[PDB]
Amino acid sequence: NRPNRLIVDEAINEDNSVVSLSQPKMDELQLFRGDTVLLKGKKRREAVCIVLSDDTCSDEKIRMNRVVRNNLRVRLGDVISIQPCPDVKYGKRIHVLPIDDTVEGITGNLFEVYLKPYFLEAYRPIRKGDIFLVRGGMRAVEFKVVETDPSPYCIVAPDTVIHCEGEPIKREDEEESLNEVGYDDIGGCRKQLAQIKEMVELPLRHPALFKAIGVKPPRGILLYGPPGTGKTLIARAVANETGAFAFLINGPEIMSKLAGESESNLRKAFEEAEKNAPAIIFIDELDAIAPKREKTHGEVERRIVSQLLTLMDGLKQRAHVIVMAATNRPNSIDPALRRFGRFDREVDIGIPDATGRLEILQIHTKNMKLADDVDLEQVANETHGHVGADLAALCSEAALQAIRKKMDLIDLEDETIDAEVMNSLAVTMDDFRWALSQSNPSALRETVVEVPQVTWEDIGGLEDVKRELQELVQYPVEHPDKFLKFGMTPSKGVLFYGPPGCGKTLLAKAIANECQANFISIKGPELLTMWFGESEANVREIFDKARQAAPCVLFFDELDSIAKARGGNIGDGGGAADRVINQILTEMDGMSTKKNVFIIGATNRPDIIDPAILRPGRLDQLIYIPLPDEKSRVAILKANLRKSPVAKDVDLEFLAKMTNGFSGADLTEICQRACKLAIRESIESEIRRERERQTNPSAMEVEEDDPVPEIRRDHFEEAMRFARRSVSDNDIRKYEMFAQTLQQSRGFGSFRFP
Amino acid sequence: NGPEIMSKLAGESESNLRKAFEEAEKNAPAIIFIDELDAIAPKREKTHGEVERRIVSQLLTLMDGLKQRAHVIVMAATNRPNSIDPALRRFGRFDREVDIGIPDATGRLEILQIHTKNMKLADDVDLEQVANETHGHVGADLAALCSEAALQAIRKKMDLIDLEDETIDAEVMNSLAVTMDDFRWALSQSNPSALRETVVEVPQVTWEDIGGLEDVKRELQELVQYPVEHPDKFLKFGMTPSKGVLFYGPPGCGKTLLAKAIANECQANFISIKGPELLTMWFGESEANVREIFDKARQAAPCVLFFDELDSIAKARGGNIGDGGGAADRVINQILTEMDGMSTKKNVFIIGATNRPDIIDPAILRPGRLDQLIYIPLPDEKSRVAILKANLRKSPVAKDVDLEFLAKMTNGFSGADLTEICQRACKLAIRESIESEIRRERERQTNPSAMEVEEDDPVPEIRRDHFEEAMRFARRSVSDNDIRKYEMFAQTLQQSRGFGSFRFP
Amino acid sequence: FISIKGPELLTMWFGESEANVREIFDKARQAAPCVLFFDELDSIAKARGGNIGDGGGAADRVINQILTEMDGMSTKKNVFIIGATNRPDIIDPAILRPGRLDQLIYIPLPDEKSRVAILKANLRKSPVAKDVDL
Amino acid sequence: NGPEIMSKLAGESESNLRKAFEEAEKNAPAIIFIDELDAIAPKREKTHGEVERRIVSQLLTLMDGLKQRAHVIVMAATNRPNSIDPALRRFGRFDREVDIGIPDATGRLEILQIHTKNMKLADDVDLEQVANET
C-alpha cells in the first residue's frame, strides 16, 4: 500500500535506455533528470538509466522497455518502486561486452561494428548486469556486462580506454542464471514447495526479526523421492526467489579425489557459505558420501562421514546457513545424520498425479509448434508410472519422429531450405501416440498416493453404509470440538465383509474423495510375498508412508489370504496367528488418532480371520456389503457405459429389472461383450467393403455410409445369451447367517428408564 | 566429542585424548565428558582396521592410570550398554551407570515451563493438557513443538504487514502472542521419536476406578505392600516372600487395572509386556530379549513386571491338541531361567494374566515361581456402578439419568460391554449436535434475515433416551458355558484342598 | 514368440528363485509385440500332490510373482499371455479373474480333416509313394 | 578397453579416461566406445578396494559433464544390465539401451555369405541347410 506501488505496462520505444514516470507522483517525490535512479522490482534485478520522457499516456502506471519483461522482472503484475539518487561520481569507462550474435561472420572490434552512435547526450548512465538488444543495424542483438573498474554503477567520460578482451559468451554457460529459474519451471510438487517456502523464507528473507523472536531455525532439510523429480531446480529456485547465495556439491565428485582433496573441498564449501550469508548449500547424491555404516569398507570413507558430522554440529553461529540434501530413501544414509541438530526436517517429493503431469507437459511444450488436435490432458491421463524426465523423453521422441517422418528426403539435400522447412514443422497426436507406446517408465512399482475421483454416484445404493462411513471418517476431520466437548474417543478402523464383486474398493475411494484425503492400497499378493519371503518388517514402512501423507485412508484388500494359503480353517494345527498380521497389530497399537489415519480392511471369508484384530482399539466394526438392488444396477450400468457411443433406444431400467442376483462384475462382463461384438462387425464391414470395391472396376467411389456408429439392442441381447452368475444362494445364506448370528448377539428387548 | 576425535589423522587423535586427560589432571578437581562414545569404541567386532582398535586400547590404558588421588571423574554418554566394547564396563573403568530415560507428564510440564518463559503466551493455555497430550515426546521434540506453535502464530496474520518493510514490525512483535490453537495445530503436525521405547512410570489408576473384589485387594496387599514396608516381620518370623502370581478369568473383567492399582498404592513403577511382543520373539527366534526386560526391571526397582496374554504361543500352535510337542517353548523357558536367577532383596514382583489357564506350562506354577492363583470374575452391582462412573467422568452428563438402575439391569456384562454402551451414547449425542448445527446455520442462510443472534444451544448434555437407544444394541461377550468352565477350574482346585477340621489334642 | 516350460517353473520352486519372472517379463517388454507362452502351468500343483496333497491351498511363490507382474503392465505395449494346462481343476483361481487371463478355450481331439492335415505335415519331408491314401 | 584401464597404476588409469574424453571433445562430432565395462564398473558390492570405487566415481563425473553442446556420444557394451553399477543407468547417463541378441536362420545365412566370399566353395553346398542346422 506504499505510495509508489504502481503497475508496469507496455513500451513505445525500442531500447532499454529511456525510462518513464507518472507525473502525479513527483509532487510528493523528487524525480529529476540526470544520470541514475533507484528503481525497485524483483530479486534486486535492476536496469538503471536515464528517465523522464513521458506523459504520452494515462497515469498510475509505469511504462518500461520491452526487454524489461525478463530484465528486472519476470512477467506482468509486478510493481515498480521509485526513488532517485543522482550525483554519482565518474569512473573512466564501464560495462562493454557482447555475448551471442556478432561472433557470426566478420569480427572487427564488436564495439566499432554498429553500436557506435548510441552515446549522444546520454553518455552511458546505466547499471551492471544490464541486457538489452541494440544495434545500428537491425536493432536486435544481445549485449552483456562483464568488466568492473569500480563495481557500483558509474558514469562515462570521453578520452578513455575499454576492455573487450574476451570473445563473447553464449547461452548454455549462463543458462541457469539467464533462466533465473523461479517457481514456474517446477511441476508436480505444489504442496511440498509450499512447505519448503514456509520453512525457509522467514529465516532467509526477514532475518533480523527472526533474531528478535528467539525461535530456532532449521539446520538440515532432506528431500526424498525417486530419480527424475526436479530437486536441484528446487534449490536454485528457492535461492533465487529469496536472494540467497547458493553453493552446490556433488557426491561422486567429492569421492573421485584423493583423501585430502575431499575434506578440504567440504570445509571450503561450508566456509564460503559462512562468508556470503544468508546462504544455502545443496548436496546431491549423499548416499555416495555417507551410506549405511556397514557397507563402508575402508578408512577414508568413515573419516569423511565423521568430518561431515562435525561440520554439521558446528553451524551454531547465528549465521543464516541452511543445508539441503537429496536421497531416495531414508534407510539409505547413516542414521547418525538424522538427529536433532543435524538433518531433522524431511520432505517427500514423490511421484506426480495427472494434474502435475499436465503442468510438466505444459512447461515443456511451450516452444514446440504443436498442432490443433492435441489434447495433452488425454496424454497426462495416459502416462501412468512416469516421472518428469520420462515425459521430457516422450516429448523429445514425438517431435523428432514428426521431423524424420516426412522431411528426411528433403533433409538430406544439403541447402538452406531446411531453415524454412523447420519454420514450417509441427507435432501431431499420432506422434505422441507412437512415442507413448515406445516408452518404458521408471516408477511402475512405486507406491501410488493420491486423491481418487470415484464419487458416490458411481455407486447407487447403500445409503446407511454411506452415513456410517461419514460418521466415522468425516466428522472428526471437520468437527473435533464435538469429540472434545463430549469427551469421546474416535474409532480408527473397520472391516468390510461380503461377496466378491460388490464394490468394496469403490466405497473406500469415495469416502476418501468426500474428505479430499489420500488413499493407499495394499493387495493380497503383497501380503503373500511378505509371508513366503519372511519379510514382514515392510509393514512399518507402509505405516510410516501413511503417517507422512495424513489424513489418509489405508486400505488392506484380501486380508484373509495367508489363512487360505495354509488350508482354510482346518488346514494345519496352528491356530489363526501369523507373522504379517501380528506386525499389523503391533503397528496399529502404536499410532494416535491425532494424526488422522483410518484403516479399512476387506474380506470375503470372515470366518477365518484372526479375532485379535476385531477387538477394541482395533478395527472393531463390521459392515455388510450385499449384492446390488435395482437402482444400484442402473447406476452401475451407466457408470460402465459412460465412455462408449451408445444408442437411445436401449433402456437399462429393464436390463436392471431382469438382472437380479448379479454382481456388478457380471454386469461389467455384459457391457464388455456387447462392445466386443460391435467392434467385430465394424471391422468386418470395413474389410469387406473396401475389398468389394477393389474388385469392382469403379474408378470413382466416395460414399462412406458408416455402418456401425453405435451399440444397439441386439448386441446386448446376443450378449445376455451368455449371461452368468458367480454367487450362489448357499453363499448368500452363509453371509446372511454370519449377519443374523451377530444381530442376535445384540439380543435385548426394550429398556425404559423408570 | 567422538566424531571430532575420529575426523583426524591417526596421530592427531591420540594426542588429543592424552592432552585432555593431562589438562584435567593439572586443573583439579575436574570433570571430563565424552559424547558419542559409541563412535570411539563400539563392539570389537564392528571394528575393521588398526587405528580403531588402537585408540580403543589407548583409552583403556588412560582409564586404568587415573589412580593418583587426583580428583578426576570421567562421565560419558551412550544409548544402550550393548553398544560399547564390554572391556570398558569393568572394575576400575566405567563401573557406575545411570539410565536417564523418557519423561512422564510432570517432567514434560517442567520442560514446557522451562522453555515457554520468554514467549508471551495467552490466557487460555493449559500447558498441563499439553503435557498429557504428548506421549512419546522427548525434550527436544517439545522444543520443536513450541517453536512451530509460535512461528505459526506469527505467520498466521502478520505476514502481510510483515512484508511491508518498515519499523512497525518491532511494535507488532511487541504485540504478539501464542494461542492454544497454535499448540493444537503443532501437536498434530508432529512425529515423535520414542513411541516404541519402553515406558516405565507410576500409574494413576486407583482402587476406586474398581468397585468390588475386596479380598483380591487384601491378598495383593499382603503380597506386595507388606514386604516393602514391614520387612522386620519377615525376618523375625524367618519367612520367605513370594515373588509372583497368576490372574485367570474371562476377558474384559479388569486384570490390568488391579496391577496398576497395587503399583500405585506402593508408589512403584509398572512395566507391561503384551502378547504381540511374545509372538514376535517366537516367530523371530529372538528370545534373548527377555534378559533385557528383566535387567530393565532391575534398574527400576521396586517394580511390578506384568505379562499379559501369557498363553498366546500355546494358542498359535493349536490349543492343547495342536502338535505332539508338549507345553514347553523357547520364550517361556527363558522367562523361567530369568525368574530363577533373581533375589527377593531387589523387590521385583511378577504378575501374569491369562484367559485359558488349561493350556499353560505347569513348570511356571511351581514353588519359587508364580505359585499363586487368583480368580477374577464378572462384576457385581457396585462394581458396575463404579465402572460406569469411571467411564463417564469426562463427559457432560445429565442428572436425570440414574446408573444404579443401569447396573441393576446389566447382569453378566463385562466392563468392556458397559464401556461400549457409554461410547455409543456419546456417539449419538455428537451426531445430533452436528446435524442441528449444520441445518440451523443453513436454514438461516436461506432465510433473508439480515440480523439473527439467538443460539439456543441444542445439545449440551447426554440424556436418557440416548442411553435407551444404545441399550437397544446391548450385547454380551461371555456365555455361561464359559462361566461354568472357569467355575469348574476353581472348584477342582478347591476340592484339591479337601480336609475336614483338624484340632490339635 | 517366447516359451517357458515346466522344468523352468519347477527349477524356480525347488530353488526359491522366483525373482527371475521379472526378467522374463522385461525381456518380453523390449521385444514387443510378443506372445509370451507358459506351458505346463499346473506343474507345481502336481509336485505337491494334486488337489488333496498338503493342507496348503492353491497359492505358491512362483505363480504369485506371475500375478504381481501381469498386474503391473499396460495394454499399450502389446504383450499377450497364453497359458496351457491339462488339469484345469488344480489351477489357482486368482489367475482366472478379470484383468488377468479370464478366458477359457477348449482344445479337443482332432476330427477327420485335422488328422489328414496332420499326417501330411508330418510326412512332407520324406520320400513317400502315391498308392498310399491318407 | 576395460582390462587395459585396469592393468595400470591408480594414476595412469584416470589420466587415460580424462584424455579420451578430452580428445573426443577436441575432434567433434565424435564417438567413444567402451568395451568390457563390467571390468571398470561392476556392482558396487563386488568392489573391494579404494581405487575401484574411485575410478567408478571418476566415470560418473565425466558423464555428468558432457553438457556442452559438443556432439559427443558414448557407446558401451555389456552382457546383462544387472552386471554394472545401477547409478550409470540414470537420466543424463546411459539412458538408452539396445539388445543385440542371438540371430535367427536368415541372420546366420547372412553371416555365412559374408564370411565365405573368398573360399572357393563347391557346387553342392546349400548354406541354407547349414543355417537351419546351426
Residue numbers in the entry:
A (entry chain A): 21 to 774
B (entry chain F): 270 to 774
C (entry chain B): 539 to 672
D (entry chain B): 270 to 403
Task: Pull verbatim passages from the article behind this deposition.
In eukaryotes p97, also known as valosin-containing protein (VCP), or Cdc48 in S. Cerevisiae, is one of the most conserved and abundant AAA (ATPases associated with a variety of cellular activities) family member. In fact, p97/Cdc48 acts as an unfoldase that couples the extraction of proteins from membranes and complexes to ATP hydrolysis. p97/Cdc48 is classified as type II AAA ATPase, as each protomer contains two consecutive ATPase modules and assembles to a homohexamer with a two stacked rings architecture. The NTDs are essential for the recruitment of most cofactors, as well as for substrate binding, whereas the ATPase domains regulate ATP binding and hydrolysis, controlling cofactors binding and substrate processing.
We generated three mutants of the human p97: F266A (D1), F539A (D2) and the double mutant F266A F539A (D1 & D2). To structurally study the effects of the D1/D2 mutations on p97 we used single particle cryo-EM on both the single (F266A, D1) and the double (F266A F539A, D1-D2) mutated proteins and obtained 3D reconstitutions at 2.7 Å and 3.4 Å, respectively. Coordinates model shown from side (left), top (middle) and bottom (right) views of (A) p97 F266A at 2.7 Å resolution and (B) F266A F539A double mutant at 3.4 Å resolution. Overall, in both structures the D1 ring highly resembles the conformation of wild type p97 bound to ATPγS. The D2 rings aligned with the ADP conformation. (E) The D2 ring pore loop 1 (P545-N558) of p97 F266A and p97 F266A F539A double mutant also resemble the ADP state, as evident from the pore dimension and the interactions between neighboring subunits constituting the pore. Given that the proteins were purified in the absence of exogenous nucleotides and both mutants present poor ATP hydrolyzing capacity, while retaining the ability to bind ATP, we postulate that the obtained structures represent energetically stable conformations in the overexpressing bacteria. Addition of UN to wild type p97 sample resulted in a significant reduction in its ATPase activity, as was previously reported. p97 F266A had an intermediate ATPase activity, attributed to its D2 active ring, that was further elevated upon UN binding, suggesting that UN activates the ATPase activity of the D2 ring. (2) In accordance with the all-“up” conformation of the NTDs, the affinity toward UN of these mutants (F266A and F266A F539A) in the absence of ATP resembled that of the wild type p97 in the presence of ATPγS. Presumably, as the NTDs are already in the preferred UN binding conformation.
